[PDB]
Amino acid sequence: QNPNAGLFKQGYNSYSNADGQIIKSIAAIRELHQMCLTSMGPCGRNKIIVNHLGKIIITNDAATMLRELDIVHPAVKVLVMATEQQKIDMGDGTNLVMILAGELLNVSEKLISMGLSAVEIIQGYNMARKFTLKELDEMVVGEITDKNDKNELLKMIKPVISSKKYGSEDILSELVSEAVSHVLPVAQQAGEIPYFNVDSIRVVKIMGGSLSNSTVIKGMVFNREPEGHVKSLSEDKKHKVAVFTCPLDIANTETKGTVLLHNAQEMLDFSKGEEKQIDAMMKEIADMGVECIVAGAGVGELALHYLNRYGILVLKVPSKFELRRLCRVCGATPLPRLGAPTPEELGLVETVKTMEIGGDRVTVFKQEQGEISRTSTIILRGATQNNLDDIERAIDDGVAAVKGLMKPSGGKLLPGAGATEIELISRITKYGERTPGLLQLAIKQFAVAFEVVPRTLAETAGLDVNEVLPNLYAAHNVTEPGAVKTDHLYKGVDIDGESDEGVKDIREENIYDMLATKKFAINVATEAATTVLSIDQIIMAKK
Amino acid sequence: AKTLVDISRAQDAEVGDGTTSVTILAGELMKEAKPFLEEGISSHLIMKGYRKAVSLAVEKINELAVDITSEKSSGRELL
């Protein structure tokens, strides 16, 4: 009896700005905004998620969690798609993009209720974004020389491990930086040819031990068994490795070729035929100097018997992704046939041995000097499986941080730990009074939206908001008796954890944020909030 | 609560004794932190308060634990 006005389409869902859906869309994001507020920072924690298949995934990274969560509202999917922009390109800063984009909608909610048009809200952020991009170039304090030294890598990697896993940042930094120096060649002042990739560092784990007992290998590490009576090869230089896609067995016909026995006469011929043919093919491989054979397919019973007499190490890698990284080290190439070890396609390994690390004997793959490897692997050890899986996800974020050292402003850095977001407030408000017109409302609120980063770090650390926050404003804003500002520009936001009064200087712990990561995160978070504010209506249909 | 079961399986593996006591101690420590949440105390200082207490406990256990070889004993008389 009671009609409904405004919907002429169908019984599907129609979201219009008349009832304030733009506020409800932010409220739905606000529910997931506080989710990321419990993630970023050293006080954050991983979330336990059980898949529909009965699998438990535990990770601290929020961008990975978004892939494991079911998103209903399509307005959140825009932020999820914008979050992947930060994870795919720079690989770091996903927490800075999602939290800021959620706060840009919070400060815009006060402008919508005030009566300010959403078009002038977007126009204000577009003008404030160009004002921020010009300041980020002048806010650079130090610059990474790209020396690729182990001590120089500890400066960038330490804050990357920070706000993910706390207390292990001293041990994990030496493990990650050691593997980076192994995959990087010797060069300087050359940005033409890229070197470091994201697959150059493999992460393996084993139960037992601790993080202090972990080591770093210069090449791929295999946790499986040698599958033969030969445990390891010798120490001789430049061992030959052959990768075979064809399985190890008597040569057959590509079409069918199933062995059948009609009579006992064919039994002695086919049994001895497999013995003479395989031994003849394995002998030609051993005569060429190949002490290691990589079999991508299954291995027969008679094949393992002859490889033990010739002293050839058996290796089986069914995964094609591991074979690609194997070609980058020794130079071997998979051969479509069996018994033809062409020396041009063969690889060279300096040292390959089977050693016991973490309680179990594993056969690793590494080098010494020649045949420089572009791929390395870090062996992790620990007594806690939950924290062990979290380090695996934390190293992957550190691998992408090394990639940010390339030509697009890789050396420049900005002070982190809340020091950058607060300093942007005084610089943007300086341009607020400079730009006349209605843009002053959106420009001032754009700088206030940066207060969520220092407030979240102080709230999760147990510090009083009424105490640390007014000290943060007085740290970046001071009155100097002179024309040139001086003394401390290094005052950041401190997590404490033991005790302190006021704040601390960033120069003590050398916690810095890359310019390429921060400048790219602001543009993504601005365009993400621009899309949400530009949508005043959402049309959906039931599935 | 699966974490209490996971640490109990590691308690029976790496050690073998105290599988029941490690969960009760972790649960009672959780019960003592219940009034801390009602008063508004954040979990950061709660973690750092217990981690410092355990650090002072291990240093005290080493003083309480008596392992002697050449001091007023030998490898036999002690046993």
Describe the secondary structure blueprint for this structure.
The structure is cut from a larger assembly and holds chains A (543 residues) and B (79 residues).
Chain A: E1 14-15, H1 21-37, E2 47-50, E3 56-59, H2 62-68, H3 74-88, H4 94-114, H5 118-138, H6 150-161, H7 169-183, E4 201-207, E5 216-217, E6 221-222, E7 239-244, H8 264-287, E8 290-295, H9 301-309, E9 313-316, H10 320-327, E10 334-335, E11 347-349, E12 354-357, E13 360-364, E14 376-382, H11 385-403, E15 413-415, H12 419-432, H13 439-448, H14 452-460, H15 465-476, H16 506-509, E16 512-514, H17 515-534, E17 538-539
Parallel strand pairs in A: 4-14, 7-8, 7-10, 8-9
Antiparallel strand pairs in A: 1-17, 2-3, 5-14, 6-13, 7-11, 12-13, 15-16
Helix pairs in contact in A: 1-4, 3-4, 3-17, 4-13, 4-17, 5-12, 5-13, 5-17, 6-7, 6-11, 8-9, 12-13, 14-15
Chain B: H1 2-15, H2 19-32, H3 34-38, H4 43-64
Describe this structure in words.
The structure is cut from a larger assembly and holds chains A (543 residues) and B (79 residues). In chain A, the strands form six sheets. In chain A, strands 7, 8, 9, 10 and 11 form a five-stranded mixed β-sheet that branches. Chain A has a three-stranded mixed β-sheet with strand order 4-14-5, covered by helices on one side. By secondary structure, chain A is an alpha/beta fold. Chain A folds into three domains: 275 residues, GroEL-like equatorial domain (GROEL, domain 1), CATH 1.10.560.10; 116 residues, GROEL, domain 2, CATH 3.30.260.10; 152 residues, GroEL, CATH 3.50.7.10. In chain A, strand 12 and strand 13 form a beta hairpin. Chain A is elongated. In chain A, helix 3 packs antiparallel against helix 4, helix 4 packs parallel to helix 17 and helix 5 runs antiparallel to helix 17. The longest helix of chain A is centred in the middle third of the chain and has 24 residues. Chain B is mostly helical. Chain B is built from four helices and no strands. In chain B, helix 1 packs antiparallel against helix 2. The radius of gyration of chain B is 18 Å and the shape is flat. Chains A and B meet through loops of A and helix 1 and helix 4 of B.
